[PDB]
Design a protein around this ligand. Structure first.
Ligand SMILES: C[C@H](CCC(=O)NCCC[N+](C)(C)CCCS(=O)(=O)[O-])[C@H]1CC[C@H]2[C@@H]3[C@H](O)C[C@@H]4C[C@H](O)CC[C@]4(C)[C@H]3C[C@H](O)[C@]12C
Ligand SMILES: *C/C=C(C)/C=C/C=C(C)/C=C/C1=C(C)CCCC1(C)C
Length: 226
């Protein structure tokens, strides 16, 4: 009965409720273009719900020795993020009619981000954990650069309503995503300053905002309609 369980429980509830709501709304829509955004966006909190639930029930946690101690590491987070982060990026790419090659590069970079983050999280030599963290953060910054510079450029060719919706979601994404490496650095996976219970809270707030919040903004907009 780990003290972070309460945030895993609340996370499970919020992702579950978000999923159900998006599913109800999405099943009701008949516009083909809107249905695509609903499918992608409903899947995001659906995956997160399954991983939060698994963690709540005591799975996706392993002990990694570093710094002379046995450290608890929630590896299930990375299984969630491996699939949900590219899905969020795909929502943004569809909104701005991004090029196929841009999408492949973004999804590639995002995979490197999550994959190297996981390797870092599991690494037994303390200093090397941070090498992997740095690589992961570089991949993240590539993603954010492309969203901020590249996608905004593409968005300029869309109707103002679509461009406006994209900018809100872009802004939400940059603010929330940029916090993740800092939480990792100061938390259980990194410097061990912020205790696991508080870190779980922080990741829960970030995750729910980045998936359910993002989804609410996108799915209530006229931008998703063809
Ligand atoms: C019964 C099974 C397996 C036992 C072996 C164990 C393993 C992990 C346990 C849960 C978590 O600890 C989180 C949480 C802590 C609260 O305190 C009480 C409720 C809750 C949901 C726990 C219930 C139960 O105890 C679980 C499912
Ligand atoms: C729904 C979940 C979202 C939007 C998660 C985003 C997660 C990141 C942007 C994670 C980035 C990381 C780094 C930049 C380096 C350290 C470890 C990673 C996975 C946390």
């Amino acid at each position: 009965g780990r003290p972070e369980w309460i945030w895993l429980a609340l996370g499970t509830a919020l992702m579950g409720l978000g999923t159900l709501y998006f599913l109800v709304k999405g099943m009701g829509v008949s516009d083909p273009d809107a249905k695509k955004f609903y499918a992608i966006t409903t899947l995001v909190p659906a995956i997160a719900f399954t991983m939060y639930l698994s963690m709540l029930l005591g799975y996706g946690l392993t002990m990694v020795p570093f710094g002379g101690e046995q450290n608890p590491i929630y590896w299930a987070r990375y299984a969630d993020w491996l699939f949900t982060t590219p899905l969020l990026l795909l929502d943004l790419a569809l909104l701005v009619d991004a090029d196929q090659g841009t999408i492949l590069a973004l999804v590639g970079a995002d995979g490197i981000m999550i994959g190297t983050g996981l390797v870092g999280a599991l690494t037994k030599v303390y200093s090397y954990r941070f090498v992997w963290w740095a690589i992961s953060t570089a991949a993240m910054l590539y993603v954010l650069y492309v969203l901020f510079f590249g996608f905004t450029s593409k968005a300029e060719s869309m109707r103002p309503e679509v461009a406006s919706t994209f900018k809100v979601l872009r802004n939400v994404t940059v603010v929330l995503w940029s916090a993740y490496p800092v939480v990792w650095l100061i938390g259980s996976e990194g410097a061990g300053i912020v205790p696991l219970n508080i870190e779980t809270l922080l990741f829960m707030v970030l995750d729910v905002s980045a998936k359910v919040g993002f989804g609410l903004i996108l799915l209530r907009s006229r931008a998703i309609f063809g």
